Every structure is written in C-alpha cells, then in structure tokens.
Amino acid sequence: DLYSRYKKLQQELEFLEVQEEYIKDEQKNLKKEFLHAQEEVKRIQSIPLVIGQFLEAVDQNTAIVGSTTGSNYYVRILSTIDRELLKPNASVALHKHSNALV
Amino acid sequence: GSGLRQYYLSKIEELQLIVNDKSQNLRRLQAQRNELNAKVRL
Amino acid sequence: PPGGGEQEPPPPPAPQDVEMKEEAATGGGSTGEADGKTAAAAAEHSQRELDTVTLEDIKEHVKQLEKAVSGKEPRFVLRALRMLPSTSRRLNHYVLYKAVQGFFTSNNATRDFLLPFLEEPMDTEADLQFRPRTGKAASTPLLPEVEAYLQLLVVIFMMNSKRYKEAQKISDDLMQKISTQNRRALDLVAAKCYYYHARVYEFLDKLDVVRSFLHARLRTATLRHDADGQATLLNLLLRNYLHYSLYDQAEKLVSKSVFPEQANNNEWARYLYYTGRIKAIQLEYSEARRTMTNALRKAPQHTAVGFKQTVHKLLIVVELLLGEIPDRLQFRQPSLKRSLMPYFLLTQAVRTGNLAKFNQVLDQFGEKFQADGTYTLIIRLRHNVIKTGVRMISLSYSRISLADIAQKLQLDSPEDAEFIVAKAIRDGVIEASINHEKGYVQSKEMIDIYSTREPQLAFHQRISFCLDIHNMSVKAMRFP
Amino acid sequence: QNRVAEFHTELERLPAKDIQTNVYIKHPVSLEQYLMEGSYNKVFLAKGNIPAESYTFFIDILLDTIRDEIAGCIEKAYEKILFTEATRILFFNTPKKMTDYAKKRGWVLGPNNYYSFASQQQKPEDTTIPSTELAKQVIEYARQLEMIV
Amino acid sequence: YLASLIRSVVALHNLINNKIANRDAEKKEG
Amino acid sequence: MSEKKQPVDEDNWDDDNVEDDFSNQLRAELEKHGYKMET
Amino acid sequence: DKKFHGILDQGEGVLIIFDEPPVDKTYEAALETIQNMSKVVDSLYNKAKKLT
Amino acid sequence: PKNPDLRIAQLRFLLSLPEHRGDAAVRDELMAAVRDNNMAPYYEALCKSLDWQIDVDLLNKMKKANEDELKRLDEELEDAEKNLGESEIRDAMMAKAEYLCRIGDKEGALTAFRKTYDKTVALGHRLDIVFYLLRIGLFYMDNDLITRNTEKAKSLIEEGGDWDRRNRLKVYQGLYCVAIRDFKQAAELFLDTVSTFTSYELMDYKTFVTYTVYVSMIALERPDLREKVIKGAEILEVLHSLPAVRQYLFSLYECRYSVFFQSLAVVEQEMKKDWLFAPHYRYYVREMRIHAYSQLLESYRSLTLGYMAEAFGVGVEFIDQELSRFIAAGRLHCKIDKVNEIVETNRPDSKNWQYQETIKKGDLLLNRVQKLSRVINM
C-alpha cells in the first residue's frame, strides 16, 4: 500500500489538474454562450407588440400592467430590462399573443 | 521504517496535501460553473 | 460568616457553565475538523484559539474552589474515547461529573494532580491520534496554574508539564503524523507555553537550553512545516538575545530567516518591532524608523498591551536623532500619561539650543532612560543637536551663507562654522554646495516628479496590491 | 578602522564599566563621540591624552580615516581652499602629501591652489528606455486582470 | 490606480458577504 | 497578546508649536515697537 | 484680487505676466472618491465587527 | 433677573485669575456680592478670594428669607386642587426654580430645571429651562456638562426656529460656542450676526460685533471677505462706532502693513484683559502676522527684506528671525535668503501638490484594507 500510496497520490495529482484547466475552459466558453443567449431572446419583439403602460410589480420578475386596450393584466417580465426604469407608470410594450413586458 | 519506510512515508506527505487543497479549489470552480449553467439555461 | 457565607452560591456556577462548555465546543468542532476537514489548516477553532488567547487570561485563574473548576480537570482529562459507545459514555460523563461538582466535592487539583491526571487520557483504550485534543489537554495543566501567575515552586512543575508537551512534539515528529498538519497548531501551543515559560526564564536565569532546543525546534521548520513557529520561536529567540548585553544583534542580522509570511496582523506587526529595535541598535538611519512607524501603525488595536508603550516610546526617539523633531503627545493615552514625562522633557532640548537644559534633563531622568534600554541616545544625540539646528536654518534660507549660519547657532567662531560643513554633503542633511571662493552654502530645488516617471513608480506596487486583494477575495469566497 | 556597527555592539556588555570608568575605553568612547558630529580633528586637539601607551597605531588610522573623507569632501563640489588650508590646517607639514592629493586625487596645485573639475555628467536622460519594459508592465496588468483566476 | 483601488474593495465585499452566509448557515444547520 | 508588561495603565505639533516653536503664544513678544520708536 | 495674472519683483522693479493652466481637475476628482472609499470601508468594517 | 444674571459670572470669571489686576474687579465685585441679593457663587469663592468684607451674616439671612419665600409653595403647593380637575397644577417650579438658580445653587437649580423640563412637556418651557442651564453653564463656568444639554437641544429641541430657536438662534454664537475650543466655529459659526442684537445675553449691538470682528478675519484672505467685513452694512455701522475695530479692519484690507502691528497690538491688549485666559490666543496675533505674510509675501517673489525694513515694520533682524520661525515651521511657503537680502518664494505645481496628497490618502486607505484584509479569513 505504502508504495502504491505514493504512486496513487501521483495519479491523483495530474488527473486532478486536468479538471483544473477544464473548469477554466468551461467558464470561458460559458461567457460566450451567455452572450449568445442574450441576443437570441431579441426575436420576441419584432416591433408590432402593443403600446401599454407599466402599473405595478408584485414581486421579482412579475408585475401588473394596464394596457391601452382598456383592460388590465397580470404579467411576467424579461430579465434583460433594467429595474431602474420603473416608477410612475412608464410607457411599456407588450406581446400581442403573450402580453408580457418585453 | 526510518531508513527505508520514512523516505516514502514522508514523501506521500505533499502528494496528499496537494490533492487535499486542490479539491477545495476544484469544488469552488464547480460551484461557479454550475452558477453559469443555471443562468444561461434559464 | 454571615457576610461571607451568603456570597458564594453564585460565584462557582458561572465558570461551571461557560468555562465548562467553551472548550467543550472547542474540542468538539476541533476534533470533528481533525478527523474530517483535511483542509483544517485554518480552523474556525483557530479563532477559538484566539478566543482562548484572551479566554483564560480573564475567565478563570484559580480552579474556583467551592467546586466550580476543580472538577473540570478530572472530568475533561478522563477522555478515553475508544469508539462510538465508549465515547458516548464520555458524552454521558460530561453531564455525569456535573453532579460531582454541584452536589459532591470536586477533585482538588492544585497544580499537583494534573500530572497524575495525565493517566485518564491513557485509561480505557487511550487516544494518541488526537494530539491536538490531548495537546489542548496539555495546555490546560498550565491554564489555571500558569495563568494564576504564581512563579512560586510550581515553575518547575510548569517545566515538567511542558516537558510532557515537548514529548508531544516528539509524538508529532515520530508518532502517526501522516501529513496531519498539526505542527502549525503545535507551533501555537509552543507559542503559548513559551510566553509564560519565557516569563519562567525571566523569573530565573538564562535560557541557553531553550536556545539550542530553539535552534532545533526552529531547525525542523523550513524543511517539512513552516508557519508561525519560525515566527514566534524567532521572536522568543530575539527578545532575550536583545535582553542580554552582548554582541547579540549582528547575529540577528545574519539570521537570514526573516520571511515567515503573513502573521494575521498580530505576529507580523510586533515582528517589525523586534527587528525594528535591532536595526535601531546600529544607529538607524531612516531605514527602520519607517518600519517603526509601520509596526506602530500595523497592530495598534489593543489597549496599551505593555510593549506597545515601548514601541510608542522608542519609535520617534530614533527619528529625533535622525531628522524629525515632533513631540510625542499625539496619542496622549491615559496609558501614556505616566510614560511620557521624562521623554516629554527629552525632545525639547534637542531642537532648542539649550544643550545645558538637555544635560539637565538627561541627568534628571536618565534613570528612567536607563530603564528604557536606550543608553546610547546621548552618544549620538549631540550629533543631531547641531544637525537639527543646521537642518532648520538650512531649510529656512535658500542661498544661506555658512559664514553667517554658524554665528546664529551659537557657533561664535568662523572655524566652528565649518565643522559641520564637512559631512553634511556626504550625509544629505541639506542639499547645497560649499565653496571656498564663496563660503556660502546655497541650496536649490527641482521638479519633474510629475515630469519624470515618479508616479508610475509609486503606482505599480499598489496596482499589484489591489490585484492581490482581488486574488484574496476569489480565493476566499466559494466555501459554501 | 571605520567599524561603527561593530563599535556599537561592543559597548553593551558591561553596561556601566566603559562610561564613567575604564579610561582605556573612556578615551575610545569619548573618541567616538568626537567622531559623531565633526570632532575628527578636534580629536587631534585631544590627542595628548593617553592612559598607557602612545595609541599611535590608531591615532594614525584616525589620521587616514579622516584622510579618505577630507579627500572625498574636497573632491565634492567645492572651490579650492589653498595649499595653506589643505596642507597646514589639516596635517602633514609639507611632506609628499602634495603627492597624496596631487596623485591620489585631483586638484592639481601648480598656480597657488588646488583646482577642481566638473564632477558631473551631461544629463543623459532617455526616458524612452522604459518604453519597452513599462509596456511589458501593462501587458502584465491586462494579463492578470484578463486571466480567469 | 484609482480604478484598481475601488476594484479591490469591491472584491473585498464578497468575502464578508459569503463568509457571513457560510458559517451563519452552518451554525444554524447544526 | 497576553503580555500586559506596562506601567500603571494633539499637544505634539500644535503644542510643539505653542510652547517652544511658537514664542508669542505662551509669553508676550510685543515690546519691540518700544524698541522701534527710534529705528 | 485676481484681476491679473502677473508677478512683481521688489529687487527688480519688474512685472512679469504668465498664463493660467487649469490642469488640476483629475487629481481634484480622484481624492473625493477616496473620501467615499474610506466610509464604505467603514461600512464593511462595522459589518465584519458586527459579525465575522 | 437671570437675564442680567450674566455679568456676575463674567466678572467673577474675570476677577481672581488676574492677581495683580483685581482692584476694580473687587470694587464692583462687592456690588455683585451683597447687592442684587446675590448669594450662591461667592461662598464657593471663600477659599478663592483673599479679602472679603463680612457678607456671611448680612446675606445668609437674605437667602434664607427668600428661600422661605419660595420653598413654602414650591414643595406642597395644593393651590388649585381643592374643587376638581387634573391631578396637578403648573405653578410650582416653572415659577420657583429661577430663585433656585439665582440664589439656589447649581444643584437646587439643576434638579428643579430638569424636573420642570420633564413636568412641562412643551418646547415653550424647554426653551427657557435649557437656556438657563446654558447661561448657568457660563455662570459656574462648568463648560463640560452644559456642552451636553446643547447638543441634546439640537437633537429634539431644535427644529428650525419657532420663536424658540430662531429668535434665539443667537443662543448659539455667544451662549454656547468657543470659550476654549478655537476650531472651525470661528470663521463659519461666527459669521451670521443676523440680528442687530439678540436678547438673553448676546450683545451684537455693543460687543458681540467685537467677537465677530475679532473672528471675521480668520476665514479667508481675499476671496472677498471684504464684502462681509467691508461691504457689510450693519457691520459698517458698528465699525462706524468703533474706530479701533474700524481702523484694525481698514488697516488689514487697505495694505496697512506698518500699522498692522499697531492695531494688532491694540486688540492683543484686548486679549490681555479678557475672560478667555487659556485661549488667550492660539492663532490670533502672529497668525495675523503670517496672515499679513500671505498677502505681503504674495506676488513679491523677488522681494527684499530691505523693503520690509519700512513697508511692513522695522527691525530687519526681528523680521529675519520671525520668517525663520515661520518658513522653518512649514508655514509661509517661500525661500528667504541670506546676504543677498532677498525674499524669494516658490509654491508647488498643479501636480506636485496633488501627487503629494494622493500618495498620502492611498497609503491611509491601503493600510486600512491591510487590517480589514486579515480581520476576516483567519
């Protein structure tokens, strides 16, 4: 065991290090993949959405908006929007079908 | 022991210490990577 | 009897509860991180190690007769801990002996029984792998005893307990040490035992046996384990080498072991002071006054630790001798009010031209000065008397004459004018040029610290500093 | 022999035996106090006091130890104290000391004085020499800042 | 220089932030 | 830590000034004009 | 009274005019950021003090 | 009553300290001794004075008679609890603690002032009570405890005026300010002498203007201090009344370099005879000298002290050793010369200075993050 201890710890060194470089690889690739992720969400708008108005938010990433269609709704939001743009019922856009704050 | 064993018993010292630390580091990196996986998946 | 009788139901139970449970949790989590936590090099029971630094020095000193702490030792040392049943039995004993302290009489252990109490850890399938557990179990024999501050006939029993603990060094260096990283805990234990054992050799003669043993216990450092043992043992090495009047100091300078790394803002700070006085004894020349200020500003967070008054006292003593003339009333602590009066008069007659007043103060308060260990201040302070005046006027007048600057500093003779115009150039106390065709010491000035690459010089190190901070965060974050 | 660090690690072994007694040290210690401020030739105004012997072997080394430094001070930026100031005030009742300053050093005494020189460079500041290595420093900056730590 | 200065402190916040949550969740876990 | 090797338990530059570096701050200095009604 | 960018010479009987470089702005704005960084390090300070 | 109660604490605070100078202080201190029924303060001056005409018997009967005139109702009143109503009536200590200070000592005054401060929950009474605590803080010169009730007034008591701190917001320049503090309450805190004179104790129209004129000229050198000292109207009238104030100012602004020592010597003669002993002056006399050295040294890089031999004063050697006192003490930034007799000057550049400060702050904060770096993580 004792000589095989000293050999097996050696084997536990490099095989452990390749993982060290590996997580570097994964992280750097994920930085790219996330930025590819943000752009592909952009297809949701395509322009003809609706002009509505933000009203209020219940909690994280979900709020209430009263559309210019006369009615009021309960909706979710995109994670891309900056939360500093809120307050005093801002002009907002919404999906035709989904009717989500985009 | 002292002449024959101690050279390997004392040399598995750092072979054990290094894998001792790089597992802490490894799991740190694992936690970060899983953070990224959850984020970009959502 | 009616007065003193009603006043000892409450005193015992307090240490009986908290003094009971504290090291219970200490040995508990510390044991779980000795078996587990292969990365136990930084235990949170190392902050509990610090909590034991200030814990027993104020918590308990006597064994708390009326059966408060006397029964702790017979309980806490009776730790066999064979396996889960024979260890849950001791888990029962933690509460079982509590009836012995409360209802019955505890086992009296007036620093005579702890030595025979060192068999309970051997009874019923003794445990030696827990040399941390039994190591704190080797500190505890001192903890009421030494911290009682006796130094009276149990100094020797202190020494024997610390000989058993040095035998625990023998156990680490010889017995089942499979990269357990326990020396760096045994180096803190070696620290604690050798603070009050340092005092032990203060209440007795020299320590040369601990000099060779210190060169051995230090010798093992740098080969297998090196963390704070070389630091603390080096400081203990320096303190009484300095305390003794001999060569003692260039041996320290040649002691090329100066870089035991970061000491958690506690050991390193004083470390700069131990080395600082060392560099001071060779006529320090602004190279280690900066590290004196550095040490004084590194770890001042205590409240007049006792040597902090000596660093605060000796710090600007050397700077006065070099170039500066500030007083030392800035931190007029209540801890400083009685340690300021002689030095208060000390720095006045330097800048003032009343050297007879300086000799009056020196003959007046030299006894305190000689108690401070600063004998050689007068042999080189008359140096910076005229150098302090010439620094003053040299700063004042730009194109000053040396044929005029003397006559104002009570020089009184043109020959006496140029006895200070022979080394000021080589020293650099003033930037000017002396001439015989014109015996006028005219200075000059320059710029381009902004027009020469001064700032990018000053910036690089601190840029590395901030990136160091970032590295520390990234390395010390993702524990959960 | 210019052993000051060795000096001040010697007077600290017999705390009060070489201050108010032991004239064989008191003359050396007050000697060094003379070697403190400017009292190097004032020592030579205090040479006639020895307890036992001549002390010639270190009144002479105390000659030379002031000679390298008077030679350096004159070599400093200065305007030539004449032969009478560099040869009579100091030591050396006109021996080949004029060969000492005239040969060991400059200040060539032909026309009734010693004579200086520039003792300075031409201010050769490139300041673009660091234009490579400093760029290396920046490359290290973005290097470590860009590295996945 | 200033940018590195603030960057270091900002990096230093997360040390307190996670060293709080780790041990505070641990001691409450046990 | 755990040493306690002390005695029992600005005024540096501003008093370094006001007592010695300052001269007319503790004592008077304005008599020179009485030494100046002839110069 | 800042009506003029000059300088007088008693030993010369000479007035001399110069130009006014206002190039202290960056160093000006740098220090106050330090003024905030001190107090924010305080905010982390009583944080770690309140709890490690 | 307590409104003219000022002068007793001031002349007693002025008398015994000047030993050679106490003749008039006793000549009218006797007028403050038995007259005005004054009882409290002088008995504590029993060991503080050397001579004292017999006032024990002549006055103890006087404090005893009025004390009997107040304590009979102040402790048992029961005046308006005979028919019905609330369980008390506000007539006891609001009307009978004033004697408890004027003749009642600081103890019997303090216990009743606080007791009525809590009795009447109104800021109306909290006005006069707390301000009596402050004027008595000047009375027995107990200028540490009455440092507390001031800020304690600032927390809740103070809310913007309300006839209670606006009309008396001049309870805050003379009442409780620098007796001996000598810090940034001199140029800034002592500027808005808004009222012609606010009434309780601060006399702008007579001598608070002396305060704010002895303190006005410390703020700035020439970013238009002349608008508030020279273009000031209400200050223009008071300077119109006092020539020593007027000349001392008009000296300063109007390049009166030779008479700066004359008027300056006058006002320092004023500081000689004052109540503020320890703060005789930290930065008055020759911080006005060096104040004249900023403008004097200004714009005169090629200045000669020979011109100083008549333009600003005389005694070339005294100006010599003075500038030696100032340049060598980090003040009066310039380089003065030997035998050339030249007063040179040189300030830093627009980058040398800020580099010199940034190197300071970076070291400070870096030292901070040093400690806080190792506080956490072991």
PDB file of N, CA, C and O in Angstrom, chain C residues 67-98:
ATOM      1  N   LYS C  67     -16.072  24.193  44.436  1.00  0.00           N
ATOM      2  CA  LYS C  67     -16.400  23.166  43.452  1.00  0.00           C
ATOM      3  C   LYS C  67     -16.993  23.778  42.180  1.00  0.00           C
ATOM      4  O   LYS C  67     -18.139  23.522  41.805  1.00  0.00           O
ATOM      5  N   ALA C  68     -16.182  24.606  41.520  1.00  0.00           N
ATOM      6  CA  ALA C  68     -16.558  25.203  40.245  1.00  0.00           C
ATOM      7  C   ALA C  68     -15.675  24.728  39.098  1.00  0.00           C
ATOM      8  O   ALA C  68     -16.186  24.210  38.103  1.00  0.00           O
ATOM      9  N   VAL C  69     -14.356  24.885  39.206  1.00  0.00           N
ATOM     10  CA  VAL C  69     -13.452  24.443  38.150  1.00  0.00           C
ATOM     11  C   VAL C  69     -12.604  23.249  38.585  1.00  0.00           C
ATOM     12  O   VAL C  69     -12.030  22.566  37.723  1.00  0.00           O
ATOM     13  N   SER C  70     -12.537  22.962  39.889  1.00  0.00           N
ATOM     14  CA  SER C  70     -11.716  21.865  40.392  1.00  0.00           C
ATOM     15  C   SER C  70     -12.090  20.523  39.778  1.00  0.00           C
ATOM     16  O   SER C  70     -11.200  19.712  39.504  1.00  0.00           O
ATOM     17  N   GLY C  71     -13.376  20.275  39.551  1.00  0.00           N
ATOM     18  CA  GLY C  71     -13.823  19.039  38.947  1.00  0.00           C
ATOM     19  C   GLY C  71     -13.729  18.998  37.443  1.00  0.00           C
ATOM     20  O   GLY C  71     -13.934  17.938  36.844  1.00  0.00           O
ATOM     21  N   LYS C  72     -13.432  20.134  36.808  1.00  0.00           N
ATOM     22  CA  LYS C  72     -13.277  20.155  35.360  1.00  0.00           C
ATOM     23  C   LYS C  72     -12.131  19.253  34.928  1.00  0.00           C
ATOM     24  O   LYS C  72     -12.304  18.375  34.076  1.00  0.00           O
ATOM     25  N   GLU C  73     -10.956  19.452  35.522  1.00  0.00           N
ATOM     26  CA  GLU C  73      -9.783  18.663  35.157  1.00  0.00           C
ATOM     27  C   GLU C  73      -9.998  17.159  35.297  1.00  0.00           C
ATOM     28  O   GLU C  73      -9.717  16.437  34.325  1.00  0.00           O
ATOM     29  N   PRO C  74     -10.476  16.627  36.428  1.00  0.00           N
ATOM     30  CA  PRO C  74     -10.765  15.185  36.491  1.00  0.00           C
ATOM     31  C   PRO C  74     -11.795  14.729  35.479  1.00  0.00           C
ATOM     32  O   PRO C  74     -11.728  13.577  35.036  1.00  0.00           O
ATOM     33  N   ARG C  75     -12.745  15.586  35.095  1.00  0.00           N
ATOM     34  CA  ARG C  75     -13.669  15.229  34.022  1.00  0.00           C
ATOM     35  C   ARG C  75     -12.983  15.308  32.667  1.00  0.00           C
ATOM     36  O   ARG C  75     -12.833  14.299  31.966  1.00  0.00           O
ATOM     37  N   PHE C  76     -12.561  16.516  32.284  1.00  0.00           N
ATOM     38  CA  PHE C  76     -12.037  16.765  30.950  1.00  0.00           C
ATOM     39  C   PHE C  76     -10.805  15.937  30.625  1.00  0.00           C
ATOM     40  O   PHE C  76     -10.565  15.658  29.447  1.00  0.00           O
ATOM     41  N   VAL C  77     -10.014  15.539  31.617  1.00  0.00           N
ATOM     42  CA  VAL C  77      -8.840  14.737  31.302  1.00  0.00           C
ATOM     43  C   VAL C  77      -9.185  13.256  31.226  1.00  0.00           C
ATOM     44  O   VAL C  77      -8.460  12.494  30.573  1.00  0.00           O
ATOM     45  N   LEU C  78     -10.274  12.827  31.862  1.00  0.00           N
ATOM     46  CA  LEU C  78     -10.733  11.445  31.747  1.00  0.00           C
ATOM     47  C   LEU C  78     -11.451  11.308  30.410  1.00  0.00           C
ATOM     48  O   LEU C  78     -12.679  11.332  30.311  1.00  0.00           O
ATOM     49  N   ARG C  79     -10.653  11.187  29.353  1.00  0.00           N
ATOM     50  CA  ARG C  79     -11.172  11.032  28.000  1.00  0.00           C
ATOM     51  C   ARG C  79     -10.467   9.849  27.363  1.00  0.00           C
ATOM     52  O   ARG C  79      -9.331   9.976  26.891  1.00  0.00           O
ATOM     53  N   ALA C  80     -11.134   8.703  27.356  1.00  0.00           N
ATOM     54  CA  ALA C  80     -10.600   7.513  26.717  1.00  0.00           C
ATOM     55  C   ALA C  80     -10.999   7.432  25.251  1.00  0.00           C
ATOM     56  O   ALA C  80     -10.132   7.380  24.374  1.00  0.00           O
ATOM     57  N   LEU C  81     -12.304   7.438  24.974  1.00  0.00           N
ATOM     58  CA  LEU C  81     -12.842   7.619  23.627  1.00  0.00           C
ATOM     59  C   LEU C  81     -12.372   6.501  22.689  1.00  0.00           C
ATOM     60  O   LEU C  81     -11.692   6.723  21.687  1.00  0.00           O
ATOM     61  N   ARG C  82     -12.768   5.279  23.052  1.00  0.00           N
ATOM     62  CA  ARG C  82     -12.386   4.109  22.267  1.00  0.00           C
ATOM     63  C   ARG C  82     -13.128   4.075  20.933  1.00  0.00           C
ATOM     64  O   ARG C  82     -12.515   4.162  19.864  1.00  0.00           O
ATOM     65  N   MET C  83     -14.455   3.954  20.978  1.00  0.00           N
ATOM     66  CA  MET C  83     -15.295   4.018  19.787  1.00  0.00           C
ATOM     67  C   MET C  83     -16.638   4.594  20.220  1.00  0.00           C
ATOM     68  O   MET C  83     -16.827   4.919  21.391  1.00  0.00           O
ATOM     69  N   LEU C  84     -17.567   4.713  19.267  1.00  0.00           N
ATOM     70  CA  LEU C  84     -18.846   5.392  19.493  1.00  0.00           C
ATOM     71  C   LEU C  84     -19.556   5.035  20.796  1.00  0.00           C
ATOM     72  O   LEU C  84     -20.087   5.952  21.443  1.00  0.00           O
ATOM     73  N   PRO C  85     -19.602   3.775  21.243  1.00  0.00           N
ATOM     74  CA  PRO C  85     -20.186   3.524  22.571  1.00  0.00           C
ATOM     75  C   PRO C  85     -19.333   4.051  23.713  1.00  0.00           C
ATOM     76  O   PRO C  85     -19.865   4.703  24.621  1.00  0.00           O
ATOM     77  N   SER C  86     -18.022   3.809  23.688  1.00  0.00           N
ATOM     78  CA  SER C  86     -17.119   4.247  24.746  1.00  0.00           C
ATOM     79  C   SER C  86     -16.805   5.737  24.673  1.00  0.00           C
ATOM     80  O   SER C  86     -16.057   6.246  25.512  1.00  0.00           O
ATOM     81  N   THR C  87     -17.351   6.435  23.683  1.00  0.00           N
ATOM     82  CA  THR C  87     -17.224   7.876  23.529  1.00  0.00           C
ATOM     83  C   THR C  87     -18.527   8.591  23.826  1.00  0.00           C
ATOM     84  O   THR C  87     -18.504   9.716  24.332  1.00  0.00           O
ATOM     85  N   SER C  88     -19.657   7.961  23.497  1.00  0.00           N
ATOM     86  CA  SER C  88     -20.943   8.398  24.018  1.00  0.00           C
ATOM     87  C   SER C  88     -21.043   8.167  25.518  1.00  0.00           C
ATOM     88  O   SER C  88     -21.826   8.848  26.186  1.00  0.00           O
ATOM     89  N   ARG C  89     -20.279   7.211  26.055  1.00  0.00           N
ATOM     90  CA  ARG C  89     -20.161   7.097  27.505  1.00  0.00           C
ATOM     91  C   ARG C  89     -19.534   8.350  28.096  1.00  0.00           C
ATOM     92  O   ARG C  89     -20.048   8.910  29.072  1.00  0.00           O
ATOM     93  N   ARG C  90     -18.414   8.801  27.525  1.00  0.00           N
ATOM     94  CA  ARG C  90     -17.802  10.047  27.971  1.00  0.00           C
ATOM     95  C   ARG C  90     -18.719  11.230  27.716  1.00  0.00           C
ATOM     96  O   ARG C  90     -18.775  12.155  28.536  1.00  0.00           O
ATOM     97  N   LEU C  91     -19.446  11.201  26.594  1.00  0.00           N
ATOM     98  CA  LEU C  91     -20.519  12.158  26.358  1.00  0.00           C
ATOM     99  C   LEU C  91     -21.502  12.174  27.515  1.00  0.00           C
ATOM    100  O   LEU C  91     -21.998  13.242  27.894  1.00  0.00           O
ATOM    101  N   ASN C  92     -21.788  11.006  28.092  1.00  0.00           N
ATOM    102  CA  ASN C  92     -22.561  10.966  29.323  1.00  0.00           C
ATOM    103  C   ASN C  92     -21.792  11.584  30.479  1.00  0.00           C
ATOM    104  O   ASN C  92     -22.382  12.291  31.297  1.00  0.00           O
ATOM    105  N   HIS C  93     -20.477  11.350  30.549  1.00  0.00           N
ATOM    106  CA  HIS C  93     -19.683  11.840  31.670  1.00  0.00           C
ATOM    107  C   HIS C  93     -19.620  13.357  31.728  1.00  0.00           C
ATOM    108  O   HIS C  93     -19.485  13.908  32.830  1.00  0.00           O
ATOM    109  N   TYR C  94     -19.701  14.037  30.575  1.00  0.00           N
ATOM    110  CA  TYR C  94     -19.754  15.499  30.566  1.00  0.00           C
ATOM    111  C   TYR C  94     -20.843  16.028  31.489  1.00  0.00           C
ATOM    112  O   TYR C  94     -20.649  17.049  32.159  1.00  0.00           O
ATOM    113  N   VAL C  95     -21.984  15.348  31.541  1.00  0.00           N
ATOM    114  CA  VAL C  95     -23.072  15.741  32.427  1.00  0.00           C
ATOM    115  C   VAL C  95     -23.018  14.973  33.742  1.00  0.00           C
ATOM    116  O   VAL C  95     -23.464  15.472  34.778  1.00  0.00           O
ATOM    117  N   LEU C  96     -22.460  13.761  33.722  1.00  0.00           N
ATOM    118  CA  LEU C  96     -22.462  12.918  34.911  1.00  0.00           C
ATOM    119  C   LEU C  96     -21.572  13.499  36.007  1.00  0.00           C
ATOM    120  O   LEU C  96     -21.982  13.560  37.173  1.00  0.00           O
ATOM    121  N   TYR C  97     -20.358  13.941  35.660  1.00  0.00           N
ATOM    122  CA  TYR C  97     -19.493  14.572  36.655  1.00  0.00           C
ATOM    123  C   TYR C  97     -20.033  15.910  37.147  1.00  0.00           C
ATOM    124  O   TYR C  97     -19.583  16.414  38.183  1.00  0.00           O
ATOM    125  N   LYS C  98     -21.012  16.484  36.444  1.00  0.00           N
ATOM    126  CA  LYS C  98     -21.584  17.757  36.864  1.00  0.00           C
ATOM    127  C   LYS C  98     -22.315  17.628  38.191  1.00  0.00           C
ATOM    128  O   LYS C  98     -22.344  18.582  38.981  1.00  0.00           O
TER     129      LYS C  98
END
